[PDB]
Amino acid sequence: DNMKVSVYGAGNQNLYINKLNLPEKFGGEPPYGGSRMAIEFAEAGHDVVLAEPNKNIMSDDLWKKVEDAGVKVVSDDVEAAKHGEIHVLFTPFGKATFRIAKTIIEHVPENAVICNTCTVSPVVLYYSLEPILRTKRKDVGISSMHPAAVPGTPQHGHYVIGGKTTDGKELATEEQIKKAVELAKSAGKEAYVVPADVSSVVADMGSLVTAVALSGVLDYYTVGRKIINAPKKMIEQQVIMTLQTMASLVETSGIEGMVKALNPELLIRSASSMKLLDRQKDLDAALEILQNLDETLKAEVEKAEIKPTTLVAAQSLVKEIKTLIGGAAAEGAIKRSARKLFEH
Amino acid sequence: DNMKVSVYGAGNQNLYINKLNLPEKFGGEPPYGGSRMAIEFAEAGHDVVLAEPNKNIMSDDLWKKVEDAGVKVVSDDVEAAKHGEIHVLFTPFGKATFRIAKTIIEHVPENAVICNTCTVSPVVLYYSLEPILRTKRKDVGISSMHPAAVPGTPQHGHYVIGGKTTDGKELATEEQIKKAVELAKSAGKEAYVVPADVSSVVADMGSLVTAVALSGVLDYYTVGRKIINAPKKMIEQQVIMTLQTMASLVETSGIEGMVKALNPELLIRSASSMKLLDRQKDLDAALEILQNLDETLKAEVEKAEIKPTTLVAAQSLVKEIKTLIGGAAAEGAIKRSARKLFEH
Numbered sequence: 001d002n003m004k005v006s007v008y009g010a011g012n013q014n015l016y017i018n019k020l021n022l023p024e025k026f027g028g029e030p031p032y033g034g035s036r037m038a039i040e041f042a043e044a045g046h047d048v049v050l051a052e053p054n055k056n057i058m059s060d061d062l063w064k065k066v067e068d069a070g071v072k073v074v075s076d077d078v079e080a081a082k083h084g085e086i087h088v089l090f091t092p093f094g095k096a097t098f099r100i101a102k103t104i105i106e107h108v109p110e111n112a113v114i115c116n117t118c119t120v121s122p123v124v125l126y127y128s129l130e131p132i133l134r135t136k137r138k139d140v141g142i143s144s145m146h147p148a149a150v151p152g153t154p155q156h157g158h159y160v161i162g163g164k165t166t167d168g169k170e171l172a173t174e175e176q177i178k179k180a181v182e183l184a185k186s187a188g189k190e191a192y193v194v195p196a197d198v199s200s201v202v203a204d205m206g207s208l209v210t211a212v213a214l215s216g217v218l219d220y221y222t223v224g225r226k227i228i229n230a231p232k233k234m235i236e237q238q239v240i241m242t243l244q245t246m247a248s249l250v251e252t253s254g255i256e257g258m259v260k261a262l263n264p265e266l267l268i269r270s271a272s273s274m275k276l277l278d279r280q281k282d283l284d285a286a287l288e289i290l291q292n293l294d295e296t297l298k299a300e301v302e303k304a305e306i307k308p309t310t311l312v313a314a315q316s317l318v319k320e321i322k323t324l325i326g327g328a329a330a331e332g333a334i335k336r337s338a339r340k341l342f343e344h
Numbered sequence: 345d346n347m348k349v350s351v352y353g354a355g356n357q358n359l360y361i362n363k364l365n366l367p368e369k370f371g372g373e374p375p376y377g378g379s380r381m382a383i384e385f386a387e388a389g390h391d392v393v394l395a396e397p398n399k400n401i402m403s404d405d406l407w408k409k410v411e412d413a414g415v416k417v418v419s420d421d422v423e424a425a426k427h428g429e430i431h432v433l434f435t436p437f438g439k440a441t442f443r444i445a446k447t448i449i450e451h452v453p454e455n456a457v458i459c460n461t462c463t464v465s466p467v468v469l470y471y472s473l474e475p476i477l478r479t480k481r482k483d484v485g486i487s488s489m490h491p492a493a494v495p496g497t498p499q500h501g502h503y504v505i506g507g508k509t510t511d512g513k514e515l516a517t518e519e520q521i522k523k524a525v526e527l528a529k530s531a532g533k534e535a536y537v538v539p540a541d542v543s544s545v546v547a548d549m550g551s552l553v554t555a556v557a558l559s560g561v562l563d564y565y566t567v568g569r570k571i572i573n574a575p576k577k578m579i580e581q582q583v584i585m586t587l588q589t590m591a592s593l594v595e596t597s598g599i600e601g602m603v604k605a606l607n608p609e610l611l612i613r614s615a616s617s618m619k620l621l622d623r624q625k626d627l628d629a630a631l632e633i634l635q636n637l638d639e640t641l642k643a644e645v646e647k648a649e650i651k652p653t654t655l656v657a658a659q660s661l662v663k664e665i666k667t668l669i670g671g672a673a674a675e676g677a678i679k680r681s682a683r684k685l686f687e688h
Binding site: 284 | 364463494504512548554585589608632
């Protein structure tokens with residue numbers, strides 16, 4: 001393939017090189033992140049444009065490397081928009097990802113696909129563009145290419161690609177998803193297609209939380225079934241209640257408000273009595289962490305306010321709303337409320 | 345002082361003595377659980393009835409201990425219902441909690457309060473009784489009395505009492521809650537009032553999941569803010585996304601379906617490149633656990649089906665539904681869907 005590829009954002013080389021010291025702490029050599037993605041795509045033979053308005057985002061010697069790989073660098077996102085059949089956003093969190101996506105959407109070629117990388121779930125990106133996608137650009141697809149490590153480090157061995165959602169929504173066509181997969185594979189990375197509604201949870205930075213929370217769920221699942229012989233449905237209900245309540249508390253009250261509501265001291269005492277099995281290293285680590293909370297953090301937790309939080313069964317509620325106001329109106333409600341939290 | 349108390353359920357002594365091996369691993373002597381609460385309440389000078397239909401739940405010799413404390417044992421829940429001003433449901437069980445509550449609600453004395461102990465959230469218990477509580481028995485309160493460990497063990501030093509919810513709902517009057525607090529304090533216990541919509545997540549066995557998940561969130565919060573310098577709002581959004589997605593997948597697809605959806609092998613690779621600070625023992629523990637999943641478990645994960653699961657911002661969605669159909673109808677939908685998952 002000789003795909004036309006546009007990458008947006010060179011990546012913050014000061015962060016990677018000078019703050020985090022990736023070369024020594026992880027390995028590889030600069031540049032890292034989006035400009036490295038561009039280099040790898042160009043070396044795989046694709047026709048690559050890198051859009052980066054801020055020339056000072058890396059040293060002259062690193063720009064040399066980008067250029068030597070055959071990457072064409074432009075400062076104007078619209079020029080990049082017109083070039084690519086696939087558009088890869090390596091963009092600074094928040095308004096930048098949404099801003100650039102909204103900037104390029106009116107200019108990308110017929111049937112183009114736009115992919116986020118580390119910032120924003122593809123479902124949220126889709127929602128942010130939905131007024132345009134639903135009508136004038138029904139041809140444009142949304143997907144993602146989550147590296148799961150910083151590109152340029154030896155830890156970067158694959159991409160996670162957001163495909164058809166678990167509830168059957170196709171945010172991009174099969175042809176568009178195949179382009180993302182090939183782009184990942186042509187650059188020697190493995191490519192894993194995952195439902196777009198879960199892709200960011202398995203690959204982005206928050207995967208730390210996913211991994212730790214999951215180990216806790218499995219720990220309890222084992223204790224519950226193998227020691228207590230609690231019914232499976234009950235164990236599942238308790239897991240749902242805990243994860244939902246924490247998510248809802250963070251949503252209304254922030255991390256500190258959530259911490260205030262759950263009360264680490266009380267939590268430690270109850271969780272302690274669940275120390276039963278041979279090795280529950282997750283539980284041991286958790287008890288040590290909660291009992292030695294940051295001095296500033298404890299003070300910031302006591303200052304926090306617990307806001308009104310509604311107990312819900314979320315997927316059961318989604319079904320309830322679909323039957324109540326109809327599929328179209330429910331999806332509208334889900335879209336608008338998702339945007340208000342994750343975009344606005 | 346010297347209240348009339350009714351306790352329902354003596355507790356599965358085989359579980360406490362033989363499954364959990366409490367006498368050796370934790371301490372104290374049987375009976376444990378509900379019958380031990382009755383004993384302690386009687387030793388504090390209260391007038392106690394213990395309702396237990398199955399006399400074979402424990403040996404005659406353990407029954408002796410209960411009677412010697414002055415506890416009156418009956419097999420009929422309705423008899424206990426007429427006796428108490430406070431009713432304590434010791435049903436770590438399943439739906440028996442709902443059956444007994446529905447049996448006693450028409451028979452409890454004026455102004456009685458009904459408290460569950462483990463597993464079932466008082467908000468859900470309230471919902472299951474709501475048509476009667478909102479019509480014929482507006483005098484009755486619902487609360488909870490979650491022990492910090494199994495009653496009878498040395499580790500049990502406090503109770504968590506479910507009070508007014510975070511969104512300001514009063515399931516019981518302030519006076520009924522203070523009665524519960526006074527009772528809980530029997531035998532020298534501490535008693536803490538926690539909003540009823542979060543009390544079960546802090547004190548029940550699911551607190552294992554709460555503690556471990558919280559340690560992951562705090563780990564990521566620290567790394568995110570102090571090392572990577574990720575914006576706080578980004579960290580909170582990813583935390584919400586992770587917790588919500590795991591909760592929703594378990595709800596639609598079970599533990600096995602959720603694991604299948606998130607894929608521990610993929611998870612280990614992404615989370616590994618977040619081993620980014622001196623001590624992150626939760627992360628270390630999680631990576632080892634995910635890498636050594638139970639064989640029998642793995643086969644049931646490959647057998648599992650990932651069911652339609654909808655990405656949502658739950659509290660934002662609750663607000664959106666309210667603006668669409670009004671507060672009363674929204675609360676109806678929330679109540680019906682909560683009962684469908686947590687009560688059936």
